[PDB]
Design a protein around this ligand. Structure first.
Ligand SMILES: CCCCCCCCCCCCCCCCCC(=O)OC[C@H](COP(=O)(O)OCCN)OC(=O)CCCCCCCCCCCCCCCCC
Ligand SMILES: CCCCCCCCCCCCCCCCCC(=O)OC[C@H](COP(=O)(O)OCCN)OC(=O)CCCCCCCCCCCCCCCCC
Ligand SMILES: NC(=O)C1=CN([C@@H]2O[C@H](COP(=O)(O)OP(=O)(O)OC[C@H]3O[C@@H](n4cnc5c(N)ncnc54)[C@H](OP(=O)(O)O)[C@@H]3O)[C@@H](O)[C@H]2O)C=CC1
Ligand SMILES: CCCCCCCCCCCC(=O)OC[C@H](COP(=O)(O)OCC[N+](C)(C)C)OC(=O)CCCCCCCCCCC
Ligand SMILES: CCCCCCCCCCCC(=O)OC[C@H](COP(=O)(O)OCC[N+](C)(C)C)OC(=O)CCCCCCCCCCC
Ligand SMILES: CCCCCCCCCCCC(=O)OC[C@H](COP(=O)(O)OCC[N+](C)(C)C)OC(=O)CCCCCCCCCCC
Ligand SMILES: CCCCCCCCCCCC(=O)OC[C@H](COP(=O)(O)OCC[N+](C)(C)C)OC(=O)CCCCCCCCCCC
Ligand SMILES: CCCCCCCCCCCC(=O)OC[C@H](COP(=O)(O)OCC[N+](C)(C)C)OC(=O)CCCCCCCCCCC
Ligand code: SF4
Ligand code: SF4
Lengths: 72, 137, 235, 155, 111, 359, 115, 440
């Protein structure tokens, strides 16, 4: 799992890398960044990653009742 | 004043109504002729609502209600100006002063509903902002 | 004329009120108030012109404009009449009833084949009518643009033959047609130049702006006429 | 063939069977139209048009306006026709037989050289003779504007 | 209290719809201009030598097919719209006996 | 349907053709056959064409109504469903409908006659000419469809021509021609369940006393599939029908409750009883005034005839398929014409049958 | 921003017993809306079978032992409910869910190509 | 629960209910009929009324709508008319481009980017070229960079003509749409004259552009540029000063700077909120450092501010376009490296090493050194970026595409909260939601 942060303050970009397995959850950054609500919703849809703390996690791209996570 | 010419017009327009409905019913090709898949009745897919494609399943603002409700008092004010129109000369100054008084009392109603802002939709549910205040110890 | 138009208003709101489609039934409560609100403004304007001639006859109003056309003294009423006329026919920029981007075809999103044409024809009978009514109330109706040109043209025909009366009828309807055409042009012209007006700001326009002005004039015209001893009588 | 009877028989048939509020509002419009049309012919053309302008244009479309607000939810052919036929038999509103069977005329005269419409006389008397009736009416209209807002307005 | 316009000037523009009447006037200027419409199919919009359209297999002036069944185009094709089957011709030439383009699968890309 | 319409991937016909199927039986698969469904734009043809094309069997569909055939193509992959314009007064077209085929199906038939065709020309002349041309075109198997009471001795014209139609097929094609005699087929947009749902049914008491046996249109479509793909059914006659006996008068009333339609049914014209000599007269007039197929005189005689089961013929147990009862399928075919939605199961429908007959 | 109807927070449970209470609670929620599922989706079967087939799918996972598998099967358990309630799936999907349907002998599979 | 639901005054103790003929319990078995004997008031705040949980009126602003300029299913939960909650259901245009790129070389993966944002076609393929060239440790020659700036602004003009004018069309102004779309026809002619396709020109590629400009293209970009300034004025005539336009936009869709940075709003829906940030300045790329141009920053964060900023970005594009017409240098348009750029056909048919490289470039592809990148550009919609992961092979291992519209559409609920249905139409137009990018 990779995060890209933008600092409009100092005109800089930083990248956070954090791993995950198929069953191990990852903390949700939605409480900090509201813009990750849909980016986390998309990652689960295409990778099946469990995001702990997300207010509403569901399919966003694939059809309803789509079996399997496509980008695996 | 004769109105037998007017009567024939109203009768013809009444006849024109039956013609518009039935001309469709006699010129459209038979359902068998086009595709036979069914009539409008059985073809419930064709005889249904339009919801842009996806099938789905009035607590209107009180401001809209007061717009319609206040239409009725203001309409009876306008319709009761009709007698003054065709008698403006023969009532003279007396009927003109009465007419102005008839309008002033109704205007005091216009003032009342202008000050309360009754017709404004308002936004009481949302558009809230707050001050972030630190609570140091 | 005002009574007949209000029956048509009842016809419009009935289209959606017998339907369960959400888009079609949406355009009833907003349709009802828009026509209700701008009916007071259209009714009062007609009554001010009728007050200046003291007659509720269409022919008397037209003939009363021989020396002057009511667009010169009552220019603001003509703008108010034309604005109101747009709303009553639901034409843009007062288009929120049948707004394609907002409510698709409005009530007509459930109409097809004959019910669509009859309802579509009604909207354009009103456009022709309300354009003719603006010509009658403010631009003299069938009166000529020039009395001299009218006189010179008719002197080429003999009044003892039916050919004279065809030419006069063609002329007199021609003057009305040219005046009416200018407003059927303006129905289209304003549609190509003004973005659609939001409904909530549309109901407050006729009540908080137009109506006070229209009542202000209806207490103004009798005052000016009385001051100069010019109260009208039907000759 | 006084066809005004057949319009009301249809109207009297649907008043006995109406279920929802759509048909109830239809009985209103189906009653004014015979009232307007029977006033246009015969008695008073002025009050046929006043009724259309004031009832249909003002108070009828208010009913359908609030019906869309209120809600939209949720007999036997022998008894209806039997009732309608029984209702149909006796239609003499008054029992002065001579007054209903003998015709009358009036004689015109030329003494009135200032001929003007009825609405001219009604305005002549309402704005002069009965200016109190006119002024109380604007007072009753004023109370309604206040009365509507106090009943309905929330805050 | 710091508006430069007087009250009457701001209300004359407001009541007489100053910018709307201008907006109408600019639209009416276009009414007396030459439109842009061309009467297709009697006229055609411009084309350039680089334009991509329908596919065609070419020849040499001598008449021999230009394709030597090299299968390059099949390997570039982003949509895999090309199917080539080849072998040595009857006279020894390296020619193709089957060559299809799925014109409903091609993206008209020119690769 | 299922996943494979065949029992084997190699199938040899009467003519020495060896047809090898490829694939798993889905859209991209093939069966090697090539049928020809006549009247595939008809009610039964659409289901029959759909099932054949669903499994990769090329189907030639002769048509005359240009627009009515367009929706047939969705069932097959590219190049599967082919269209041949034809007219039964044209022979060349029919000789091209069956040119490359390996199965010929004949669903052409009528119970009404027209200004250009009579019942004699359609139920007898067309079927004969098809079988004569299908035989000369080297087709291994022919399947024919007739009425449920095919009886050349019937006074009714429909069963007079339908009964003779069976003979002229075997007298033209030969003793291999299969024959199917379905009962009244009920389905979505079916001619049978239509007149039961039609509101203003003039002469209801005259028409609805006729008794029949319901049968699923899909099972008829699936039965025709098993017949074409099996060579052991050649020369056999099938009488397809259901078990439970239903009368239209029972159905027209059981339907009435599902539709949920006091004063109204009598006022709306749901019941329109009629003296028979009038019905023979009005239906007589519409034969030459109406431009559309109306309930004609010959159909009136059929209302005097209940369904007859020719017990010497075969049924669904020969095909190893359980016939489907109208109890479980009546509801889903009246939902188009139909708080909580009222859903009728098999038990709900059977109980509703009891209420209709109870006085 | 606010969540949609019938939404729940995504928390990774750490106790086995805690999950079963959530699992059992969710089961009646499926059962409670069963009649509405038929009404909203216009299903051709009575609500009894709708309640019937819901129960079977819960049992299919009954015997999982490891905890991290338990959560993900519960996280996806809620999501399928939330979509079903809010009418997000179309009628085609729900019909095909409940419209689903002994193996052939060796000769029979051999005869028709097998797998 | 799910299906239904159920004091300001002193709790008053009433005991000993009695009438003149007896006490309550003496007639309590008959008081169910006497409605004046009901002890249960219907105005008490504790009155139990079992009311069903009727769901809020939920309109389906479904795909078949002129407002939905793609395939959108917008679910609006409103009290009356003021919108409480909105649930955008994207994915109706999900085609799995990211899954398909992993099976194709870098040269075949390029056309997948013209099909993300249908209207900003060349800037789409500029961000894939920049990312791959960054991974390839290669730099486009001088003329190539000017061409990508020249068509980086022609594409920006193409986008705003599509976005600003279709936004006005939803609001009601039909005519300004038509005037601008003839400029789009004139600009698409430049797309077709250099590449061969009006829309999906695979012109910009890793290493530069496909072909050189045809003779006389510069003299057509100029002749269009002399007149185009008047075309913007005639658009600003009908909209900028129109009181009906300002009633539809001023005060609608307001966004604070704190909210914009949190939701990652970029491009114009961040400078409307007052933040002066622009990616052509933060990380200048492809000759954007050579030309001189200004940017416009809003102050009210509403739709009218974003309307003004876009109309300024029109005139700043027309200011860059002229400079690229005057500063255009001569030389190669692509890297002089035949191991990443195909050799010219004439050299291919005459030089042996050119034929070898032409062969291996069109079948095997070119290898990209292992690693990863995140390349962002100032797309016309906002900040568009790709996260490409390389594995030393000729096919990208991963390619995540960060579409500006996707991050905007998330913030729709946070902005539309407290607005009416005619106001939602404005907010969608002010976001520039082409749903190819949203549903990549
Ligand atoms: C130019 C002709 C205009 C009228 C066209 C319709 C004519 C049909 C006959 C209705 C009018 C008869 C007058 C009496 C009103 C009866 C209204 C009624 O009961 O419902 C009629 C209509 C159809 O429903 P129906 O099947 O007849 O009744 C059971 C339905 N649950 O239920 C409906 O509401 C469906 C929509 C009908 C809306 C009609 C609105 C009321 C009529 C106003 C226009 C006509 C004014 C009256 C003129 C004739 C007066 C006798
Ligand atoms: C067809 C129907 C007829 C159509 C034509 C109608 C014509 C009648 C129009 C009604 C008003 C006409 C009179 C307009 C002049 C009076 C208003 C005025 O003088 O301005 C308002 C004035 C404030 O002065 P202000 O303009 O704000 O000064 C700012 C300097 N920078 O305010 C003041 O301080 C004094 C206001 C004047 C008091 C009497 C009113
Ligand atoms: N419930 C039922 O439907 C029952 C029907 N049957 C019989 O099954 C057979 C198939 O009928 P069905 O599919 O159910 O419904 P249809 O009556 O609609 O099928 C009739 C078919 O025959 C074609 N047809 C009729 N006349 C001609 C003609 N001159 N030229 C070419 N084609 C013609 C029709 O073509 P086109 O569509 O283009 O007009 C149509 O495809 C019929 O014979 C019917 O009597 C027996 C038991 C039950
Ligand atoms: C005024 C419009 C002028 C142009 C349109 C005329 C086309 C209509 C002619 C028509 O309907 O002719 C075809 C008809 C009948 O054939 P059908 O296809 O079943 O008719 C369809 C319409 N019915 C079924 C309602 C009748 O023939 C006649 O009745 C011949 C006389
Ligand atoms: C805008 C048209 C107004 C118009 O035509 O009037 C503008 C004026 C006044 O003319 P008027 O009083 O309206 O003309 C009515 C009298 N007739 C019948 C002679 C026409 O015309 C000129 O003198 C120029
Ligand atoms: C005469 C009858 C036809 C016109 C009727 C309507 C009049 C509208 C103008 C008055 C309102 C107002 O506010 O006028 C004043 C305004 C605004 O002035 P400003 O921005 O302060 O000027 C800036 C400073 N100067 C004064 C130094 C220049 O001028 C206008 O916008 C003029 C609009 C003219 C074009 C529209 C007329 C043509 C319409 C179609 C005719 C067939
Ligand atoms: C004394 C002389 C009397 C003159 C009478 C004429 C008055 C006309 C209306 C003026 C008021 C006004 O345009 O008002 C604007 C209103 C409401 O604006 P608001 O909500 O108050 O905000 C603005 C004001 N502020 C900031 C002070 C609060 O909405 C509109 O945009 C209505 C535009 C309607 C245009 C319809 C097309 C015109 C067709 C006719 C020409 C071809
Ligand atoms: C106005 C004239 C109406 C003619 C309709 C007509 O005559 O139609 C009726 C006949 C019968 O033929 P059909 O309608 O196809 O029979 C099918 C319908 N059944 C099953 C009810 C029989 O048609 C003709 O013989 C048409 C000849 C041309 C007549 C002039 C046109
Ligand atoms: S295989 Fe393709 S690229 Fe190669 S020679 Fe033939 S057409 Fe040209
Ligand atoms: S133009 Fe078409 S056939 Fe040629 S490479 Fe591109 S997609 Fe393939």
């Amino acid at each position: 799992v990779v995060y890209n942060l933008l600092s409009v303050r100092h005109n800089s970009r930083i990248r956070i890398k954090t791993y995950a397995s198929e069953v191990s959850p990852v903390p949700s950054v939605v409480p900090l960044f509201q813009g990750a609500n849909w980016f986390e919703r998309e990652t689960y849809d295409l990778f099946g990653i469990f995001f702990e703390g997300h207010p509403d996690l569901r399919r966003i791209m694939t059809d309803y009742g789509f079996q399997g996570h496509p980008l695996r | 004043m004769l109105q037998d010419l007017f009567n024939n017009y109203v009768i013809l327009v009444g006849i024109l109504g039956l013609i518009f409905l039935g001309v469709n019913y006699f010129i459209v090709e038979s359902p068998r002729m086009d595709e036979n898949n069914g009539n409008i009745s059985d073809y419930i897919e064709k005889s249904g609502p339009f919801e842009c494609g996806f099938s789905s399943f009035n607590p209107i603002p009180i401001a809209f209600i007061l717009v319609a409700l206040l239409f009725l008092p203001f309409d009876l004010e306008v319709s009761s100006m009709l007698p003054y129109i065709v008698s403006i000369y023969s009532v003279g100054i007396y009927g003109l002063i009465i007419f102005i008084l008839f309008l002033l009392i109704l205007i005091v109603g216009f003032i009342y509903e202008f000050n309360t802002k009754s017709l404004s939709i308002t936004t009481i549910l949302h558009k809230k902002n707050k001050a972030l205040v630190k609570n140091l110890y | 004329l005002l009574a007949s138009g209000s029956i048509g208003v009842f016809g419009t709101v009935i289209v959606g009120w017998m339907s369960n489609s959400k888009y079609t039934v949406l355009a009833t409560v907003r349709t009802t108030a828009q026509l209700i609100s701008y009916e007071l403004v259209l009714t009062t304007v007609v009554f001010i012109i009728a007050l200046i001639v003291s007659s509720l006859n269409i022919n008397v109003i037209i003939e009363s404009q021989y020396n002057i056309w009511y667009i010169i003294p009552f220019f603001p009423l003509c703008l108010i009449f034309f604005i109101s006329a747009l709303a009553e026919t639901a034409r843009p920029p007062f288009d929120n009833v049948e707004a394609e981007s907002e409510l698709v075809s409005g009530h007509m999103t459930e109409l097809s084949a004959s019910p669509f044409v009859i309802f579509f024809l009604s909207e354009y009978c009103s456009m022709v009518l309300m354009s003719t009514l603006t010509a009658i109330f403010f631009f003299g109706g069938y009166l000529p643009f020039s009395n001299t040109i009218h006189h010179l043209i008719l002197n080429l025909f003999d009044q003892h033959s039916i050919y004279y009366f065809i030419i006069e009828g063609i002329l007199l309807s021609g003057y009305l047609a040219i005046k009416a055409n200018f407003f059927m042009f303006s129905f289209v012209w304003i549609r190509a130049a003004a973005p659609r007006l939001r409904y909530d700001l549309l109901i407050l326009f006729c009540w908080y702006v137009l109506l006070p002005i229209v009542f202000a004039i209806v207490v103004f015209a009798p005052g000016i006429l009385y001051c100069f001893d010019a109260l009208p009588v039907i000759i | 063939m006084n066809l005004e009877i057949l319009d009301l028989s249809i109207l009297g048939f649907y008043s006995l069977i109406s279920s929802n509020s759509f048909e109830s509002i239809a009985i209103l419009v189906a009653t004014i139209m015979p009232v307007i049309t029977e006033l246009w012919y015969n008695y008073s053309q002025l009050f046929a048009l006043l009724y259309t302008l004031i009832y249909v244009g003002a108070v009828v479309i208010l009913f359908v306006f609030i019906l869309s607000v209120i809600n939209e939810k949720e007999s036997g052919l022998f008894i209806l026709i039997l009732v309608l036929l029984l209702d149909d038999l006796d239609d003499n509103e008054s029992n002065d037989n001579d007054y209903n069977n003998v015709y009358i005329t009036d004689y015109a005269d030329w003494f009135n050289n200032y001929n003007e419409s009825d609405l001219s006389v009604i305005g002549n008397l309402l704005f002069t003779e009965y200016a109190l009736l006119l002024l109380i009416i604007s007072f009753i209209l004023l109370m309604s504007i206040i009365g509507l807002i106090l009943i309905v307005k929330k805050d | 209290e710091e508006s430069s316009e007087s009250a009457l000037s701001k209300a004359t523009k407001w009541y007489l719809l100053s910018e709307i009447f201008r907006g109408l006037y600019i639209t009416l200027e276009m009414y007396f201009r030459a439109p842009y419409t061309i009467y297709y199919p009697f006229e055609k919009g411009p084309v350039s030598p680089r334009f991509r359209g329908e596919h065609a297999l070419r020849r040499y002036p001598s008449g021999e097919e230009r394709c030597i069944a090299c299968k390059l185009c099949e390997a570039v094709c982003p949509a895999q719209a090309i199917t080539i089957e080849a072998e040595e011709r009857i006279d020894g030439s390296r020619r193709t006996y089957k060559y299809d383009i799925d014109m409903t699968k091609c993206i008209y890309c020119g690769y | 349907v299922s996943t494979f319409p065949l029992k084997s991937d190699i199938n040899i016909t009467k003519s020495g053709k060896t047809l090898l199927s490829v694939g798993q039986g889905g859209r991209s698969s093939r069966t090697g056959f090539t049928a020809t469904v006549f009247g595939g734009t008809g009610f039964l043809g659409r289901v029959v064409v759909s099932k054949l094309a669903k499994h990769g069997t090329n189907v030639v569909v002769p048509f005359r109504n240009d627009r009515a055939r367009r929706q047939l193509k969705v069932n097959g992959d590219l190049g599967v469903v082919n269209f041949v314009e034809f007219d039964i007064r044209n022979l060349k077209s029919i000789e091209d409908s069956v040119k490359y085929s390996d199965i010929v199906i004949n669903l052409i038939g009528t119970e009404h006659f027209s200004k250009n065709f009579s019942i004699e020309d359609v139920n007898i002349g067309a079927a004969e000419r098809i079988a004569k041309a299908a035989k000369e075109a080297g087709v291994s198997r022919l399947i024919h469809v007739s009425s449920y009471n095919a009886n050349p001795s019937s006074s009714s014209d429909f069963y007079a021509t339908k009964g003779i139609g069976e003979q002229v097929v075997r007298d033209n094609f030969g003793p291999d021609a299969t024959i199917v005699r379905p009962a009244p087929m009920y389905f979505r947009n079916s001619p049978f369940l239509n007149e039961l749902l039609q509101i203003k049914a003039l002469g209801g008491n005259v028409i609805f006393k006729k008794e029949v046996y319901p049968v699923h249109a899909l099972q008829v479509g699936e039965a025709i599939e098993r017949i074409a793909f099996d060579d052991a059914t050649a020369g056999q006659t099938y009488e397809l029908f259901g078990k439970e006996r239903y009368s239209k008068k029972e159905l027209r009333e059981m339907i009435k409750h599902i539709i949920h339609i006091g004063y109204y049914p009598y006022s709306a014209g749901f019941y329109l009883p009629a003296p028979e000599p009038f019905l023979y007269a009005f239906a007589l007039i519409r034969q030459y005034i109406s431009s559309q197929p109306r309930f004609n005189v010959d159909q009136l005689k059929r209302s005097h005839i209940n369904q007859e089961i020719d017990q010497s013929a075969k049924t669904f147990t020969d095909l190893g398929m359980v016939p489907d009862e109208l109890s479980e399928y009546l509801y889903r075919y009246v939902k188009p014409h139909i708080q909580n939605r009222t859903v009728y199961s098999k038990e709900d429908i059977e109980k509703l049958r009891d209420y209709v007959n109870t006085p | 921003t606010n969540p949609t109807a019938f939404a729940q927070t995504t928390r990774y449970v750490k106790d086995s017993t805690e999950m079963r209470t959530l699992v059992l609670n969710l089961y009646r929620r499926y059962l409670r809306h069963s009649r509405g599922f038929v009404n909203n989706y216009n299903l051709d079967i009575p609500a009894s079978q709708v309640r019937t087939k819901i129960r079977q799918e819960f049992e299919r996972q009954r015997f999982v032992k490891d905890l991290p598998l338990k959560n993900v099967l519960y996280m996806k358990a809620q999501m399928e409910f939330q979509e079903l309630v809010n009418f997000w799936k179309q009628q085609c999907h729900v019909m095909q869910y409940f419209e689903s349907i002994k193996g052939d002998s060796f000769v029979q599979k051999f005869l028709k190509g097998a797998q | 629960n799910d299906f239904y639901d159920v004091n300001d005054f002193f709790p008053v103790q009433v005991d000993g209910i009695e009438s003149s003929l007896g006490k309550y319990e003496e007639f309590a078995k008959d008081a169910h009929e006497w409605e004046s004997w009901n002890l249960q008031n219907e105005d008490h705040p504790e009155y139990p009324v079992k009311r069903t949980k009727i769901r809020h009126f939920t309109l389906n602003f479904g795909p078949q709508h002129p407002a939905a300029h793609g395939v959108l299913r917008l679910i609006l939960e409103l009290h009356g008319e003021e919108i409480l909650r909105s649930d955008p259901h994207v994915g109706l245009l999900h085609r799995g481009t990211e899954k398909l790129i992993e099976s194709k070389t870098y040269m075949q993966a390029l056309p997948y980017f013209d099909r993300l944002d249908y209207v900003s076609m060349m800037t789409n393929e500029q961000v894939f070229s920049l990312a791959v060239e960054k991974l390839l440790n290669l730099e486009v020659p001088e003329r190539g960079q000017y061409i990508r700036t020249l068509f980086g602004e022609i594409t920006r003009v193409l986008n705003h003509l599509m976005s600003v004018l279709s936004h006005a069309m939803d609001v009601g102004a039909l005519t300004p749409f038509l005037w601008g779309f003839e400029e789009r026809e004139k600009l698409m002619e430049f797309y077709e004259r250099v590449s061969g396709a009006r829309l999906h020109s695979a012109y910009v590629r890793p290493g530069g552009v496909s072909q050189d400009l045809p003779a006389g293209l510069l003299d057509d970009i100029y002749m269009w540029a002399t007149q185009f300034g008047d075309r913007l004025d005639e658009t600003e005539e009908l909209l900028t000063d129109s009181r009906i336009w300002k009633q539809r936009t001023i005060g609608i869709g307001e966004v604070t700077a704190e909210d914009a940075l949190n939701y990652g709003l970029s491009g114009v829906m961040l400078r409307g909120s007052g933040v002066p940030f622009d990616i052509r300045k933060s990380q200048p790329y492809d000759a954007y450092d050579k030309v001189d141009f200004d940017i416009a920053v809003g102050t009210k964060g509403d739709c009218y501010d974003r309307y003004l900023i876009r109309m300024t970005e029109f005139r700043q594009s027309l200011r860059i376009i002229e400079q690229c017409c005057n500063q255009m240098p001569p030389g190669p348009v692509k890297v002089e490296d035949f191991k990443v750029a195909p050799p010219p056909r004439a050299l291919m048919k005459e030089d042996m090493e050119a034929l070898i490289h032409h062969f291996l470039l069109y079948t095997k592809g070119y290898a990209v050194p292992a690693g990863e990148t995140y390349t962002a550009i100032e797309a016309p919609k906002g900040e568009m970026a790709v996260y490409v992961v390389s594995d030393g092979s000729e096919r990208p291992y991963r390619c995540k595409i960060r579409a500006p519209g996707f991050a905007h559409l998330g913030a729709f609920d946070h902005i539309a909260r407290g607005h009416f249905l005619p106001d939602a139409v404005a907010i969608i137009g002010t976001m520039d939601l082409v749903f190819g990018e949203v549903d990549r």
